[PDB]
Protein: Carbonic anhydrase 9
Amino acid sequence: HWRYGGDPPWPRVSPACAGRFQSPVDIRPQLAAFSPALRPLELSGFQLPPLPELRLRNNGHSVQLTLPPGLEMKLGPGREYRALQLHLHWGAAGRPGSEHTVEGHRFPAEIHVVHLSTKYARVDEALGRPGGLAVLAAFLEEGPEENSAYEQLLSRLEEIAEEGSETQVPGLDISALLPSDFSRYFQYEGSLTTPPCAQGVIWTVFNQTVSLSAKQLHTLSDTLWGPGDSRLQLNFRATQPLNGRVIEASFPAGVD
Ligand SMILES: [Zn+2]
Structure:
């Protein structure tokens, strides 16, 4: 096991974290390869009914929501996935904590929805295989008012403040935690951003952000406890070198 912002350096315990094709990465849109074959993402089953409830847990490194069977995500022909869980990465008071960056810019927080390829019946079989797992990532930014979809989760953090504690939340519209623009995104091949840092993961990063109130962002970053009696904050990995990888863009970056 392992921690953010301190020893042991991940390769000392998970050597695969020293791989060449790790995540997250710094995205530079003017250098991304424009790929018009990347069509709008397609989701189905994400609008969940209130029952059954979903497991929400503080695992010491993030807050993780377990997703039920039946959520489908298609990146394109031959690339169909089932969603497994989502979790978040964040900073601290006045300090951003997203995992991916854009031209070196770090955003307040980031959401990851993790999926299993329909080629595989179990996560174990997919680990390390190219395209075995896919993650949808979106940046969380500050907007003027409360995000009602996020409030259904964020209002439940207080009761799972202790590391290892868990609770149950009503079904909600998972797609409402994501951007509304499904057409504009970046895509590349990388790794899990925690040990064991397994490679072969298809990363799709929305260009559009989602807006949370400043109060919500403080709730996310200030409520949970991690290992020891440290606050669960700054739970992101440093960006990793591309090492020749090409990041694709589904849209024309543009001008400015
Ligand atoms: Zn993550």
